[PDB]
Amino acid sequence: HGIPVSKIFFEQGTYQCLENCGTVALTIIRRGGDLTNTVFVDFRTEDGTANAGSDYEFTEGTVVFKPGETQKEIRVGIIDDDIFEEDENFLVHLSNVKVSSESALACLGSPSTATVTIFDDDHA
Ligand SMILES: [Ca+2]
Ligand SMILES: [Ca+2]
Ligand SMILES: [Ca+2]
Ligand SMILES: [Ca+2]
């Protein structure tokens, strides 16, 4: 052993957005190791106190770090409505880190899960 490996993780642990922000942006980071490799990482949302379909969009997919890339941005739609609510949150999970051919070259780091605070923008 004694060789460094790439680490995948969110740039921040918590993100924020007004309910009228349209979409919230999370940044996935890839650090160290051999950056000439192609690395795949899956992402996926989960409900907290905010619910998919009424507060945000169920969003999922896969990010691909091409050689030399150290940062990838992802978007989650925020559903704006006209009703009063508490400030809520949902989760976004990284998983399934794989290296491409042509798994300790690349690993999931910490934080592999980010939280998203949605501030309500309505009165009552
Ligand atoms: Ca709600
Ligand atoms: Ca809402
Ligand atoms: Ca609103
Ligand atoms: Ca609302």
Q: Where are the domains of the chain?
A: 1-120
Q: How far is the CA of 21 from the centre of ligand 3 (A)?
A: 10
- The whole-angstrom separation of Cα 122 and Cα 124 is 7
User: What φ, ψ does residue 91 adopt, rounded to 5°?
Assistant: -115, 155
What does the chain come to in residues? 124
* Ordered DSSP codes for 68-94: T--EEEEEEEB---SS----EEEEEEE
Reading across the β-sheet that carries 6-10, which strands appear in turn?
71-77, 23-31, 6-10, 106-108
* Cβ(112)–Cβ(95) below 8 Å: yes
Name the binding residues for Ca(2+). Answer: 19, 55, 80-81, 83, 85, 88, 120-122
- The whole-angstrom separation of Cα 26 and Cα 41 is 14
Q: How far is the CA of 90 from the centre of ligand 1 (A)?
A: 10
- The whole-angstrom separation of Cα 39 and Cα 71 is 12
CA neighbor of 80 nearest in space, from 37, 29, 33, 121:
121
Distance of CA 65 to the CA centre of its chain: 14
1-120 — its CATH code?
2.60.40.2030
- The whole-angstrom separation of Cα 6 and Cα 3 is 10
Resolution (angstroms) stands at 2.5
Burial class (CB in 10 A: 0-12, 13-18, 19+), 77: middle
Give the CA count within 13 Å in the CB-facing half-sphere of 69: 15
- The whole-angstrom separation of Cα 65 and Cα 69 is 5
Q: Which two tokens stand for residue 106?
A: 């690349």
Experimentally, the structure was elucidated by X-ray
- The whole-angstrom separation of Cα 124 and Cα 120 is 11
- The whole-angstrom separation of Cα 59 and Cα 57 is 6
Q: How far is the CA of 63 from the centre of ligand 4 (A)?
A: 31
Q: Which two tokens stand for residue 117?
A: 């605070």
* Cβ(39)–Cβ(98) below 8 Å: yes
Q: Which two tokens stand for residue 108?
A: 């999931």
